Design a protein around this ligand. Structure first.
Ligand code: FES
Ligand SMILES: [K+]
Ligand SMILES: [Mg+2]
Ligand SMILES: [Mg+2]
Ligand SMILES: [Mg+2]
Ligand SMILES: [Mg+2]
Ligand SMILES: [Mg+2]
Ligand SMILES: [Mg+2]
Ligand SMILES: [Mg+2]
Ligand SMILES: [Mg+2]
Lengths: 70, 137, 46, 96, 86, 92, 108, 99
RNA sequence: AAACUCCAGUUGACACAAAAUAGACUACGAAAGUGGCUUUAACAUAUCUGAACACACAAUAGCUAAGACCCAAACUGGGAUUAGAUACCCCACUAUGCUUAGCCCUAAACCUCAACAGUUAAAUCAACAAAACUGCUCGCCAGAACACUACGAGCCACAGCUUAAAACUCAAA
């Protein structure tokens, strides 16, 4: 899928989230998944340049209050 | 200070001394451990032969030369003849894979000399002369 | 670009005119080609 | 349907592993580097199972060592004692 | 011959433990392949025999490593029976 | 030669005995076979070849401890094939 | 092409070393060479004893002469390096910089 | 190989079964089973997965049908006359939870 | 036991010989072959197939001249051996293995797979070897033995190498 690319960058940049996956919950949302949704919303409501989208998504998540250690 | 397995080098100064002398001044015991005979020669650092003893010189004859006991006797004889010339510490240089490779060093130690280093100098050609054909026994 | 680089480099070549000066300068100089590599792939210069 | 998979190269593909000397130039004059791949006690060149180098760089190191040895830059029968305290990169232990 | 002496194949004795030094030298010579070279150089090995021996040794190493890998992989399954009785 | 398939599938006698005894002692003098075996310092008494040359019996001196004897026995049976290969490779 | 001459010279005093270096470079130019640089690696103990010109050497001075010469000069120069009595060992190789540093993607 | 037409794809080296096809296949299988049960046919469940032997035997007992979750001896079906009796009735339908 | 004692050990000087480790690599070359270092030349063909004989090459052994000679070694001597010894172990030393210029042209010269192009659907498929085939071309084969033979012909070969039958005989091979 398209988001896989984003996911890869996330898992290479911010690493695997300290929070544990819960695959029993049908509607679980990982930190990477929240990152992907914010990335897609920013893409659809703005321009398309991968790096600015990445940094802006990081800024927006930190604004919401999600910890992201590089 | 951590013990160094590697020998000292003549250039770089080192604090290792044996009876006040440095490494490159200790006498050298050259052991040749052949298949049928063993020969021990003690020389000084400046290559002065001090003592010599082989299994044939200690009375052992024919197949009895190539045994551990004979090499031990040769080592003891060389150790005595070198002790009579002021040798205590020695550097052992062994050559060959005969039965007396280690028995000579037992004899040398049992004769009173102290071994401070063991060196192997067995001739290993990088494919020079052609060896003989395998025996068809 | 290569020709221009060669042009700039030729000015420092040894010639029969500057043989003495360059020889003495070399005798008053030392270069080291030795360097080591770590398990992590990092160069360790002397 | 917009939810169907699309064709692309594996984005999670981990980059291929590289040897410690990948991208670096091996000179026959750099005796310090070449001495890291020979036996301290015999000077024998270590194989790739010990050095961990790739085949290309293993060949480069071998040719450089032989060239240095025959041109009078490196000893053959042992490793130069000046390089005995250099970093250890070879997977071998004599328990010395 | 032309090399400095007491550097190659040289081991220092610690606390007079000559036996340990000799055994360490033996280990060094064995793991560097010098002992095998000396033993093999007593008699001439014909080139075809040498080639066959090297091929056999290489393929034996490969086969043994593969079998060991298979056994280690299937050893994870060896445990107490979780569905005993059924 | 499909190695994967292969692996998947008297006066003379006295001289041979003496030669094999010397060769086996020489092999045991070093870690050439294995470091573990080298540690145990196994000593051989004699080597006897069967009259049909079907097996080589190497008589090794036993110690007084029983656990040491058992360990030596185990390593020896585990290393016999390697000794045979080494002996045949050295062209003894 | 571009060549590097590795020179192991006798362990001499400064004037003799300078004269020998001048003689070597003059021979190079006489054979048609354009010398780029003369580089000193230092005086050091040889890795082994070298017997040259009926004299045994344990130490020597290491020098590097980078130059451009015709393909025919090399052999001729080698002959000259065989006759000079102050050179322990002279060897001409293709300059290492000319070889291309091919890039690698890693172990397959 | 013969499972390929039923595979939606491979997700990071793990095959995924196409559930749209599974729905139709299950519909046909369940319809066949129901029709055979309506006709009073003998149904024998079979499975060698030891984790589910108890569950499958309980299910077979509950629905009034038969189960064989144990070691399958040679000749249960092709030699039933010698092994059960000359007038034994063989199953009319066999259901594999593990093939 | 013979042999050497102009012997043996350390040290120093010192090949027309063959090339530890790397190489657990699997590369170059038409094959044969090629694994010490440097340098110079240098690895044909923008369809494919295309020869016992045409044109160029061919491991090891062997033969001409010259040369070198550490080690190894057919033969040749000597030492030790039962009861017809050990052909086999030991010592000494030849042709030969090496170089230069010519011959000879044979190998389990084998991946025992003829060269190019294509396919993996079939029934996969006598057996084994090495999964089964298709298209196209050249070479070769039609029971065994006689016979890697005789004769003819050709060849730096003079017994050699290539090509290669027939008569009698058998029911098999
Ligand atoms: S892996 Fe790239 S040079 Fe070795
Ligand atoms: K073959
Ligand atoms: Mg053609
Ligand atoms: Mg024809
Ligand atoms: Mg030929
Ligand atoms: Mg010849
Ligand atoms: Mg001769
Ligand atoms: Mg020959
Ligand atoms: Mg053809
Ligand atoms: Mg004929």
């Amino acid at each position: 899928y398209h988001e896989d690319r984003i996911r890869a960058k996330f898992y290479s940049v911010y690493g695997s989230g300290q929070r544990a996956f819960d695959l029993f919950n049908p509607n679980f949302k990982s930190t990477c998944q929240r990152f992907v949704e914010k990335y897609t919303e920013l893409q659809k409501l703005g321009e398309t340049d991968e790096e600015k989208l990445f940094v802006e998504t990081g800024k927006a998540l930190l604004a919401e209050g999600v910890i992201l250690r590089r | 200070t951590k013990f160094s397995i590697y020998p000292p080098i003549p250039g770089e100064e080192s604090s290792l001394r044996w009876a006040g002398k440095k490494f490159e001044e200790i006498p050298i015991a050259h052991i040749k451990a052949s298949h049928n005979n063993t020969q021990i020669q003690v020389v000084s650092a400046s290559n002065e032969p001090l003592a010599f003893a082989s299994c044939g010189t200690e009375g052992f004859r024919n197949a009895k030369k190539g045994t551990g006991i004979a090499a031990q006797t040769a080592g003891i004889a060389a150790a005595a003849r070198a002790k009579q010339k002021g040798v205590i510490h020695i550097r052992v240089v062994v050559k060959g894979l005969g039965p007396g490779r280690l028995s000579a060093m037992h004899g040398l130690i049992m004769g009173g000399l102290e071994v401070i280093s063991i060196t192997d100098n067995t001739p290993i050609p990088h494919n020079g002369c052609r060896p003989r054909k395998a025996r068809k026994l | 670009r290569e020709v221009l680089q060669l042009q700039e480099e030729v000015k420092n070549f040894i010639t029969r005119e500057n043989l003495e000066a360059r020889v003495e300068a070399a005798l008053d100089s030392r270069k080291n080609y030795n360097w080591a590599i770590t398990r992590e792939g990092l160069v360790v210069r002397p | 349907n917009e939810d169907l998979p699309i064709s692309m190269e594996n984005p999670y593909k981990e980059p291929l592993k590289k040897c410690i000397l990948c991208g670096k130039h091996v000179d026959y004059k750099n005796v310090q580097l070449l001495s890291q791949f020979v036996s301290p006690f015999t000077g024998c060149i270590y194989g790739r199972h010990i050095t961990g180098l790739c085949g290309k760089k293993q060949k480069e190191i071998t040719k450089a060592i032989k060239r240095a040895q025959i041109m009078g830059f490196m000893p053959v029968t042992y490793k130069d004692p000046a390089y005995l305290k250099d970093p250890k990169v070879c997977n071998i232990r004599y328990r010395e | 011959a032309k090399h400095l002496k007491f550097i190659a194949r040289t081991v220092m004795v610690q606390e007079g433990n000559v036996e340990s030094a000799y055994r360490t030298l033996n280990r060094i010579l064995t793991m560097d392949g010098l002992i095998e070279d000396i033993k093999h150089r007593r008699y001439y090995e014909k080139p075809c025999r040498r080639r066959q021996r090297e091929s056999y040794e290489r393929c034996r190493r490969i086969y043994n490593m593969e079998m060991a890998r298979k056994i280690n992989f299937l050893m994870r399954k060896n445990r107490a029976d979780p569905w005993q009785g059924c | 030669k499909n190695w994967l398939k292969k692996f998947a599938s008297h006066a003379r006698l006295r001289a041979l005995n003496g030669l094999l005894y010397k060769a086996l002692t020489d092999l045991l003098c070093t870690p050439e076979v294995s470091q573990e075996l080298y540690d145990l310092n196994v000593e051989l008494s004699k080597v006897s070849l069967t009259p049909d040359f079907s097996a080589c019996r190497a008589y090794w001196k036993t110690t007084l401890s029983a656990e040491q004897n058992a360990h030596m026995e185990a390593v020896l049976q585990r290393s016999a094939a390697h000794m045979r290969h080494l002996l045949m490779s050295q062209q003894t | 092409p571009r060549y590097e001459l590795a020179l192991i010279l006798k362990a001499m005093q400064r004037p003799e070393t300078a004269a020998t270096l001048k003689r070597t470079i003059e021979a190079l130019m006489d054979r048609g060479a354009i010398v780029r640089d003369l580089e000193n690696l230092g005086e050091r103990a040889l890795p082994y004893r070298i017997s040259a010109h009926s004299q045994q050497h344990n130490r020597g001075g290491y020098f590097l002469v980078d130059f451009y010469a015709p393909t025919a000069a090399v052999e001729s120069m080698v002959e000259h390096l065989s006759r000079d009595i102050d050179v322990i060992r002279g060897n001409i190789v293709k300059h290492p910089l000319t070889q291309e540093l091919k890039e690698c993607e890693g172990i397959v | 190989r013969f499972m390929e037409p039923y595979i939606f794809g491979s997700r990071l080296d793990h095959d995924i079964i196409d559930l749209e096809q599974t729905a139709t296949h299950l519909q046909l299988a369940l319809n066949f089973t129901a029709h055979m049960a309506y006709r009073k046919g003998i149904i024998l469940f079979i499975s060698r997965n030891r984790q589910f032997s108890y569950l499958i035997e309980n299910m077979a007992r509950d629905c009034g049908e038969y189960a064989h979750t144990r070691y399958f001896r040679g000749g249960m079906l092709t030699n039933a006359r010698l092994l059960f009796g000359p007038t034994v009735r063989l199953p009319d339908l066999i259901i594999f939870l593990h093939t």
